[PDB]
Amino acid sequence: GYDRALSIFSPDGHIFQVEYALEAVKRGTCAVGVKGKNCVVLGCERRSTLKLQDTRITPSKVSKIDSHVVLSFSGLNADSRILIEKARVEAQSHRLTLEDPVTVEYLTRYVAGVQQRYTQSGGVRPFGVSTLIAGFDPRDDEPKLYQTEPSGIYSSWSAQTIGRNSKTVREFLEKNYDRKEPPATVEECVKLTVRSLLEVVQTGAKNIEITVVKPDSDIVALSSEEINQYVTQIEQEKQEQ
Amino acid sequence: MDIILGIRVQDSVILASSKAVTRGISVLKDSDDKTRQLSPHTLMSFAGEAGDTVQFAEYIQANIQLYSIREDYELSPQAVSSFVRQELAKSIRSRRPYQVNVLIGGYDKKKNKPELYQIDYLGTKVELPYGAHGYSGFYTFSLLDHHYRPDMTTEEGLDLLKLCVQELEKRMPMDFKGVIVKIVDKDGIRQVDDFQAQ
Amino acid sequence: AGYDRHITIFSPEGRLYQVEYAFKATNQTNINSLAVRGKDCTVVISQKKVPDKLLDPTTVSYIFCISRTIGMVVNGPIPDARNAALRAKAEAAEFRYKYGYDMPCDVLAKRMANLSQIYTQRAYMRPLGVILTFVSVDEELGPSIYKTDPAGYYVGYKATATGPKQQEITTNLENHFKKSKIDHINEESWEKVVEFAITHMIDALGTEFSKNDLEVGVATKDKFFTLSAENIEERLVAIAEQD
Amino acid sequence: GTGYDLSNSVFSPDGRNFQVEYAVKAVENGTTSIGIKCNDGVVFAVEKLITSKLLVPQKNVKIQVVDRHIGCVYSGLIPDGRHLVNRGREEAASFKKLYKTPIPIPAFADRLGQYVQAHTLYNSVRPFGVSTIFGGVDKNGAHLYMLEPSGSYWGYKGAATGKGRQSAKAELEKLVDHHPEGLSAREAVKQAAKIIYLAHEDNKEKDFELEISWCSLSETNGLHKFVKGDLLQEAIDFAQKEIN
Amino acid sequence: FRNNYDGDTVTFSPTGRLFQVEYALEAIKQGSVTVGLRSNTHAVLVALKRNADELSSYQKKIIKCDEHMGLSLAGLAPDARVLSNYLRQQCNYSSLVFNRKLAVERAGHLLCDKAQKNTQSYGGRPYGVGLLIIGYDKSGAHLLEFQPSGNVTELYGTAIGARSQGAKTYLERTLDTFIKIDGNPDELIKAGVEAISQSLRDESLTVDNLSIAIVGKDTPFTIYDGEAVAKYI
Amino acid sequence: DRGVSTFSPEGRLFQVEYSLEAIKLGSTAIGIATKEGVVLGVEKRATSPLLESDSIEKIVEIDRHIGCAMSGLTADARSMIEHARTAAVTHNLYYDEDINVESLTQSVCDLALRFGEGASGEERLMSRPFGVALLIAGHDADDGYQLFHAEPSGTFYRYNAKAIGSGSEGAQAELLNEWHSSLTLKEAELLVLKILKQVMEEKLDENNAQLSCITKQDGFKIYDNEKTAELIKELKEKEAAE
Amino acid sequence: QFNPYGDNGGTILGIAGEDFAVLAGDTRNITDYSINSRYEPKVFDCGDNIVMSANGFAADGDALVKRFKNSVKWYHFDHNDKKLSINSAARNIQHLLYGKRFFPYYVHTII
Amino acid sequence: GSRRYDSRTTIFSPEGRLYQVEYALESISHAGTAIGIMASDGIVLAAERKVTSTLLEQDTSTEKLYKLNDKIAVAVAGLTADAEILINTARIHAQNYLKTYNEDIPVEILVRRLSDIKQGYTQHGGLRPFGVSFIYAGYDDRYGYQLYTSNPSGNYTGWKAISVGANTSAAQTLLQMDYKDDMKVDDAIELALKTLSKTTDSSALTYDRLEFATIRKGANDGEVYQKIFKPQEIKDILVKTGIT
Amino acid sequence: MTDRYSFSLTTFSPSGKLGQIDYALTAVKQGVTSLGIKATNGVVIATEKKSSSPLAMSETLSKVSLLTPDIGAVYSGMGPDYRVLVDKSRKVAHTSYKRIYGEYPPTKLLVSEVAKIMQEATQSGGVRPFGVSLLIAGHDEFNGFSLYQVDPSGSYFPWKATAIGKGSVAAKTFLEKRWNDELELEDAIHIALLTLKESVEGEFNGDTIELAIIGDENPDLLGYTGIPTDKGPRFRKLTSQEINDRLEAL
């Protein structure tokens, strides 16, 4: 019954509630995504405002919408759950009617649309979330990496980051990602990811989680050690100079 | 009706389902697979009203897959059947009820035991060593009641089924064009592509 | 902040200004009324003020006939009064239909009080700027006087008065009863009860009344009717031959 | 504090409802219109300002009929007036449908009363920007009424509203005094034509067009009809004569 | 003052005004001019179509509602669409149900009542367009003027929009003259074009800038544009 | 606050005006109509070298004879295009024919003013106006090739050429002089390509700009990068040619 | 029980010539064995050079023809007086008819 | 209209924060402290009853520890009444899951659902958020002993030990200082009491001002048991742990 | 028309306060004092019948109402709000309980119900919290006698004895001094009367004091006989007379 227009235009042509939704994203933990030649990797930093958590159960930052597509985000966690749910359902529905799992683009386009809707509907505020959706189209080996924002806009990237200090890490990636020769290995793709997060996480073996997505529903998340190893080999690259 | 047989041996569940799909006077297809896989270790066969049969199967499959994704976990066979019984039990008092009968066979990886569930369109669920929907039971139960043994091996089970299918091919008026057999065990679901002469 | 005075929400002192202001509105007509109980009847007296000469005096009233038995007089702006009256009549009819017997005066009062209480809590409904005095000779309670306000409050009385000079009318009546030591006008005829009502009305307001300055309603066993200018004149004449 | 006059259903500290009062202003600012109750019916008349020679004379009718025996005329925001009559029409149609007998003037008045009063209860609506004079003949007499934006209304002997309401009232009062036995429909028609002419002095700047209608048990059979042609001219003249 | 009383239509100013409505009325004056006039056999609508760039088209100002009725707009194009459409349905309805053409006078009442609804309820906004409706019905030719305030008047001729006053005076003058242009459409249109040019100032009515519509005795409301109105410039 | 469908003293709708201000911030888009077809061109304008430029879709197909370009808050345009495509398709299903470009446009604009918090007139459930303008171009047997500009105001205009976005007032000025009733499709192309280059903050290349056209023969097609790349070269040459 | 349908008999014919076409129908309208009228036109001109006839149950026939003509009218209102081609008319009528798929216009129609 | 009095409980601050959520959290911060510590052989829920009187009936009371399931219990910090509304829908949810799957609802599943409900009041409805924070203590055959925490924003997380309400900062530090993975229920029970004992704004920590509950799997059985300590049972454990 | 007030009228302030609830309480604090005492075999609730005029009939105004034959309630705050709450309470007792289990709800649950009603008026769109506080006393087979307090927030708690309204602070103190876990019903009634006396300015008698008890079953107040299991209501309102007799032993 409540339909007050909360997202409206201002004299300068801006929609402050959407702009503010973005401010919530800036505050969320960083998130990064880089696509290799045969994979895509998603990295996210873990806050430390309070540490004494039970990592096993505490909701993880990377989510699977289906067995071949994942979605990470930056912003209000509660808000992200709602988007993830809708995405997962649309995923199953699409398979049920088209008899073929969703493409990464399609699934992205869906989530983005949901967001855009919340920017011009009464009684509701926009999602304080931005997302990275990665995966492989069915029967396709070419990696896919997409990003969305509260405004509802979306586009694909070779590598991208969102969240606090995404400014910094984007730079790193802008001057460390050659489209000419993208990380041709799961290893070198994951390394580049960790390197970018280190630019902002400030030594956080437990503050960095990587998930690697390969063709044909081959998704797996690394453990502290696996990651810790990448960090170690990277701090040496520095000292060895 | 179509044949839907099910038998739970020592370490798995076997589902035999006829391949014929008759519409009126002509047998439109003799290679029908009256089954859907709800999860890596849970299989559901079904028989009934023309359109409802598959619609219901695919509807249940979709929901189970969604649950699996959401919780990154595979519901126990029991859970899945209770969900299915509830669905049918709703459908019975609805405007147009799903006239579908199902057999759910799965391997409970937590209990490390195979389970076979029989549920009719009324939402009548019961768990058995072996079950069947329609007239199929009338011809085969006397055989199963006789030769069934809890410790049977997957090979013994298939032999017993083969026997059942033969009695069915002998005393039943309709040509159901043979059956497709599938095994559900600790390692998942696979199809015995050689029962046309096993 | 300052809007806690435009809608029915609590002020920091825990008040509801809108209800208070509504109470103010009730005096806007500048008319006083009072009710008293006879031995077997109930009378309501109200001032009748017709300023415009172009008005049709016969269509100017604040005394209504809710049901064959309930009589209601209103203190406040006519539109709200007529609104209240209509609702009251509707409620009275329905109650009979649904329960098989005439809605008791006190019940209709409670019902109206409750409806008003709602405007007190819900923010889209404004209170009605009126005070309703219901009367009748209930078949279980006998002569009855029940009045409600914009606050949703209500109670029964031995007699009561409402209006700008309500306080004088009240203390006047208060005194007469401390004297008589009973809770009603020990009279057998309503004509006399009416005369008493009009008399004590005059003493309290300190004013003389013609037959077009008053409006009178009378409730008796199975009936509630209002007197005519002439039925009034008769009353006025009788009191006269006594002073 | 303040701001009590911005929301419609709000009570100011002195128990008033400014929006309603502001509505009245719209009424006062409007044209003048009147109602005269005669011995067996009623007469309605209204001032129609002729903004220019372009207005098709006689064509922009303002008086409205409800059912077949009620006449309505108002001053203020014309559209609000029609809106109210529309309601009054449905209101009457329902009544006749259920009770068979056409709606009694008093009953009809309350219907409009309740409806208008209704628009002073919530802040989600605006009060009616008009005062309406209406009436007709029924089962027991002729009745004349006037309804304010507050929803308030009473029965009148004569009634007027709009720019020149004071003049009218004055004139109407004279009539009341000088005819204790009762005016006739025929008379009321002319008398009304005059009073409109007089009251037009508070608007003498603009030229106008007169409009009269009446409901007389003997002159119109209880049915509301417009005074046209001869009977009309006769009244215009009767006025134009006493305007000098 | 005003500022506290013009946030919505549901509010009256202390003097009894409805600014939101008055503001709407303003949108009309800002709109291009258009004129209407009738005789005893025909009714004409002359309109000046405005254009954005010299690359843009000149927006249509005349809409046909039925075979015997039409109108010209001045203000928010969309609203004219909404309203003219609602007028089309009302005509259609009258014909389908009663096999009766809708009386121009009646069409006016409906338009008024539709506009009034947006001036007494919270949430809405008044229509921001002026309309001139002409039509030939069972009582001859007609010309109506519609204001978002809900006020609809019947005139012999008129105009609305910017500088509209020019033509309005001209017509008020040429009254006795055109009101008698019966049986000769060409003359009424010319008398119409002459009234509209009385409100020009920027340019001069060109071929793809002038728009004329006519209806009458033996003439189903028809619209003339471009080349078709050449013989009138 | 104040209603979302309120009028300013100058008789304008606030939410709509403010809407146009956001459009001004949007990427430049240009349309040129010619008796040989209509050309639509847009400034991709990616916000980072890491953003794959071809995932920027600001020119879409509504039907085989209708295509359109957007400018401003592009996400707002998705539903507008869905509605447009559905209208075209639906029209075809009912009438066994192509929908007129003008009609299609009118249909889209109909959504425009359907906003508010409870405007009495139907059920306009949409908290705010669209923050994007559109250039709808197409062809139909009744009015040949056409270019339309649909604004969030609900009104739409037909142009021989039109430019919306950040470089509009400038580009439009250009078009004003450059346009003539006898242009050819190639001229139009180069022309769009040129004006885009003038107003674009970036150095126009086949990656931050995109062309497209619609012709009675082959309908609506978007020029792939290679096709445009050359058209850019051809322009560099004709410009250095004097 | 009430039967919503009836049969007014009559017969119509439609022949297409290379550059012309005709749609004929008798003018008799009956009920059972009685004649309701010896002259009640059954074929109509609907504008845009289209002639249509919905033979069968009169009430349903008129409703359709009425509804179609009104469809033509609105076609013009919605597409700048564009002419409704015969093929378009037909497809339009298919929808008009299929719209009452579960309570059919008891009529056989030709245009 | 109404818009005037609309607080807009669901908008972002220019900093991208949710006013009401933040404020509600502030509300929570003044509520009696509640603690949840998870041991290898069970979970402990401890809460400090805010405000008390001699006459307050403590045997019939339960203002902070509520049972949701036979395997799930929550500790409340904030509006008791709001909490109950949520607690009830929580309880129904558990039962639905049971009826649908014939298996008890996995802890996280229940927690998430309840959290989403809260999140809702955050993005739409124009209603005020629930001023409640929960500590969920429960067990399921997939993750066993789990400890969750949810606040007005609709966010939830898992912990080994955590507190909600007043002086959470102090409490969290004290717990983070003496918590060890290999802890045992009896160890937690103690740690809990100690922490509260050092954060309380009251004189001493008496049994009358505490609510205690444990979720163990009594070895002599093989199933999960919830034990909400009785006044007497708290008075005991309070003396034993040496706080008398 | 149509309530367009779909948003909450009670919201969190930066300090974390919920204004409307706070103010509601303030309104309660102005209300005439009322109290409740729990004895070992019964409970007693009482308040002052503040006749707002001698012409008014204070009887025709019960501040002490029966909710079910074993539960009574009394308040302090706004009478009109209380009245509707009582109606709602009496009904919810049926609709959400008697009509399901065939027996009246136990004190704690009915209280929970009432509390819910109030809580919603603290959050639902377009309304204000109730401006009252209630003290409900009842008795159910499995919980015995109990006394609860319900505040505008929707919060409730069980008491051995307590008071609310005007002079609750003083009354509460006086009660703590005289309450013990061995009181017989009469004792509490006695203590109630005393405690109330301090809060009363003028006349203090069975006509200015309203008092009810929840004790033994009154078969004489059942209205019928023949069903052994039905022994009568435990809720009994004291008569003007019954109060005075006890006032003499004051």
Q: Which two tokens stand for residue F214?
A: 């619609």
CATH 1.10.260.40 is held by the domain A1-241: no
Identify the three-state secondary structure at position D47. Answer: strand
Q: Which two tokens stand for residue B59?
A: 């509807």
Q: Which two tokens stand for residue E43?
A: 């009714």
Distance of CA H158 to the CA centre of its chain: 12
CB atoms within 10 A of CB E135: 29
CB atoms within 10 A of CB B90: 12
Q: Does H144 touch chain B (CB under 8 A)?
A: no
Chain I 1-60, CB below 8 Å of chain A: which residues?
6-7
Q: What one-letter code names the amino acid at E181?
A: I
Q: In chain D, what are the domains?
A: 1-244 (3.60.20.10)
CATH 3.60.20.10 is held by the domain I1-250: yes
User: Residue F10 has what DSSP assignment?
Assistant: T
State the smallest CA–CA distance between residue H65 and chain B in angstroms.
28
- Minimal-distance CA residue of chain G relative to F104: G79
Catalytic residues of D: 31
3-state SS, chain C, equals CHHHHCCCCCCCCCCCHHHHHHHHHCCCCCCCEEEEECCCEEEEEEECCCCCCCECHHHCCCEEECCCCCEEEEECCHHHHHHHHHHHHHHHHHHHHHHCCCCCHHHHHHHHHHHHHHHHHECCCCCCCCEEEEEEEECCCEEEEEEECCCCCEEEECEEEECCCHHHHHHHHHHHHHHHCCCCCCCCCHHHHHHHHHHHHHHHHCCCCCCCCEEEEEEECCEEEECCHHHHHHHHHHHHCCC
Q: Which two tokens stand for residue H167?
A: 């002086």
Query: In a 10 Å sphere around its CB, with 0-12 CB exposed, 13-18 middle and 19+ buried, how is residue I215 labelled?
Result: buried
CA–CA gap between residue F138 and residue F107 (Å, rounded): 15
Strand partners, H36: H45, H162
Using an 8 Å CB-CB cutoff, list chain E residues near H2.
Answer: 122
Helices C105-121 + I79-93 axis angle, to 10: 100
Give the determination technique: X-ray
C14-18's contacts with Cβ under 8 Å and 24+ in sequence apart are C14/I23, C14/I24, C14/I25, C14/I26, C14/I27, C14/I28, C14/I29, C14/I30, C14/I131, C15/I27, C16/C120, C16/C151, C16/I128, C17/D13, C18/C126, C18/C127, C18/D10, C18/D11
If we measure between CA atoms, which residue out of A49, A51, A217 comes closest to residue A141?
A217
CA–CA gap between residue H17 and residue H15 (Å, rounded): 6
Q: Are strands I56-57 and C154-157 parallel, antiparallel or unpaired?
A: antiparallel
If we measure between CA atoms, which residue out of I238, I203, I240 comes closest to residue I44?
I238
Among F48, F57, F79, F80, most A C-beta atoms within 10 A, so best to mutate, is F48
Chain H 96-135, CB below 8 Å of chain B: which residues?
99-103, 106, 109
State the smallest CA–CA distance between residue I5 and chain A in angstroms.
8
Q: Does D179 touch chain C (CB under 8 A)?
A: no
Residue I99 contacts residue I138 (beta carbons within 8 Å) = no
State the smallest CA–CA distance between residue H160 and chain B in angstroms.
22
If we measure between CA atoms, which residue out of A12, E126, A123 comes closest to residue F13?
E126
Q: Do C3 and H5 touch (CB under 8 A)?
A: yes
**Which residues of chain I form beta strands (DSSP E)?**
34-39, 42-48, 56-57, 64-68, 71-77, 132-140, 144-150, 156-158, 161-164, 209-214, 235-237
Query: CA-CA distances (angstroms) from residue I147 to A228, I62, I124, I156, I162?
Result: 61, 19, 28, 10, 9
Strand partners, B189: B184
Residue C73 contacts residue C62 (beta carbons within 8 Å) = yes
Q: Do I2 and D125 touch (CB under 8 A)?
A: no
Side-chain half-sphere exposure of E232, counting CA atoms within 13 A: 29
If we measure between CA atoms, which residue out of F197, F161, F163 comes closest to residue F181?
F161
Pick B1-198's CATH classification: 1.25.40.80, 3.90.700.10, 3.60.20.10, 3.90.1310.10. 3.60.20.10
Q: Integer distance in angstroms from the first to the last C-alpha of chain C?
A: 59
Q: Which two tokens stand for residue H27?
A: 């509300």
Using an 8 Å CB-CB cutoff, list chain A residues near I6.
Answer: 1-3
Cα D170-D175-D178 angle, rounded to 5 deg: 125
User: Residue A110 has what DSSP assignment?
Assistant: H
If we measure between CA atoms, which residue out of I132, I108, I176, I102 comes closest to residue I26?
I132
Query: CA-CA distances (angstroms) from residue I114 to B189, E129, F218, I39, I154?
Result: 56, 55, 73, 24, 8
State the smallest CA–CA distance between residue D16 and chain H in angstroms.
19
Q: What's the number of domains chain F is made of?
A: 1
Cα A4-A5-A7 angle, rounded to 5 deg: 140
- Minimal-distance CA residue of chain I relative to D125: I1
User: Residue G26 has what DSSP assignment?
Assistant: -
Q: Does F49 touch chain E (CB under 8 A)?
A: no
Query: CA-CA distances (angstroms) from residue D152 to C105, D86, H23?
Result: 27, 19, 47
* Phi, psi of F84, deg, nearest 5: -65, -50
CA–CA gap between residue F17 and residue F152 (Å, rounded): 9
Q: Integer distance in angstroms from the first to the last C-alpha of chain E?
A: 48
* Phi, psi of E125, deg, nearest 5: -145, 150
Q: Which two tokens stand for residue C108?
A: 């209709």
Among E68, E96, E99, most G C-beta atoms within 10 A, so best to mutate, is E96
CA–CA gap between residue A26 and residue H132 (Å, rounded): 27
Using an 8 Å CB-CB cutoff, list chain A residues near I125.
Answer: 1-2
State the smallest CA–CA distance between residue C20 and chain H in angstroms.
20
CA–CA gap between residue D185 and residue E5 (Å, rounded): 45
Using an 8 Å CB-CB cutoff, list chain D residues near E109.
Answer: 82
| B-C interface (Cβ pairs under 8 Å ≥ 3) | no
State the smallest CA–CA distance between residue G19 and chain E in angstroms.
30
Q: Do C82 and D114 touch (CB under 8 A)?
A: yes
**Which residues of chain B form beta strands (DSSP E)?**
4-8, 12-18, 21-23, 26-29, 35-39, 42-48, 100-108, 113-120, 124-127, 130-132, 179-185, 188-191
CA–CA gap between residue C196 and residue A214 (Å, rounded): 101
* Phi, psi of H2, deg, nearest 5: -80, -40
Q: Do D52 and E172 touch (CB under 8 A)?
A: yes
Q: What one-letter code names the amino acid at G77?
A: F
Rg (CA), chain C: 18
Using an 8 Å CB-CB cutoff, list chain A residues near H10.
Answer: 6, 124-125
Which residue range(s) make up the domain with E126? 1-233
CA–CA gap between residue F6 and residue E23 (Å, rounded): 10
Instruction: Please name the helix (run of DSSP H) or strand (run of DSSP E) that holds residue I116, with its range, or none.
Output: helix I107-120
Q: Does C3 touch chain H (CB under 8 A)?
A: yes
CA–CA gap between residue G94 and residue F95 (Å, rounded): 10
Tokens 């909710």 sit on residue: I67
Using an 8 Å CB-CB cutoff, list chain E residues near D55.
Answer: 153-155
Pick C1-243's CATH classification: 3.30.479.30, 3.30.720.210, 3.50.50.60, 3.60.20.10. 3.60.20.10
Structure resolution in Å?
2.8
Residue A8: which residues within 8 A CB-CB, separation 6 or more?
A15, A17, F4, F15, F127, F128
Chain G 54-83, CB below 8 Å of chain F: which residues?
78-80, 82
Side-chain half-sphere exposure of I204, counting CA atoms within 13 A: 16
Which residue range(s) make up the domain with F174? 1-242
CA–CA gap between residue H90 and residue H73 (Å, rounded): 10
Helices A186-201 + A166-174 axis angle, to 10: 140
Among B38, B67, B78, B82, most H C-beta atoms within 10 A, so best to mutate, is B82
Which residue range(s) make up the domain with H18? 1-244
- Minimal-distance CA residue of chain H relative to I153: H81
Residue B75 contacts residue B63 (beta carbons within 8 Å) = no
How many residue contacts between C and D have a Cβ separation below 8 Å? 97
Distance of CA F88 to the CA centre of its chain: 17
- CATH classification at residue H212: 3.60.20.10
Task: Write down which chains contact chain G via at least 3 CB pairs under 8 A.
Answer: E, F
Identify the three-state secondary structure at position I200. Answer: coil
Instruction: Please name the helix (run of DSSP H) or strand (run of DSSP E) that holds residue I128, with its range, or none.
Output: none
Residue I156: which residues within 8 A CB-CB, separation 6 or more?
H80, H81, I111, I112, I115, I148, I149, I150
Identify the three-state secondary structure at position A75. Answer: strand
CA–CA gap between residue B185 and residue B180 (Å, rounded): 17
Strand partners, H74: H66, H136
Chain H 1-20, CB below 8 Å of chain E: which residues?
1-2
Q: Does E8 touch chain H (CB under 8 A)?
A: yes
Q: What's the number of domains chain E is made of?
A: 1
Strand partners, B106: B42, B115
CA–CA gap between residue A66 and residue C97 (Å, rounded): 63
Residue B3 contacts residue B136 (beta carbons within 8 Å) = yes
Q: Do H4 and C123 touch (CB under 8 A)?
A: no
Q: Which residues of C199-233 are buried (b: 16+ CB within 10 A; e: fewer)?
A: bbbbebbeeebebeebbbbbbbeeebebbeeeebe
If we measure between CA atoms, which residue out of H139, H163, H137 comes closest to residue H148?
H137
Q: Do F11 and E25 touch (CB under 8 A)?
A: yes
Instruction: Please name the helix (run of DSSP H) or strand (run of DSSP E) that holds residue A93, with its range, or none.
Output: helix A77-98
Residue C216 contacts residue C195 (beta carbons within 8 Å) = no
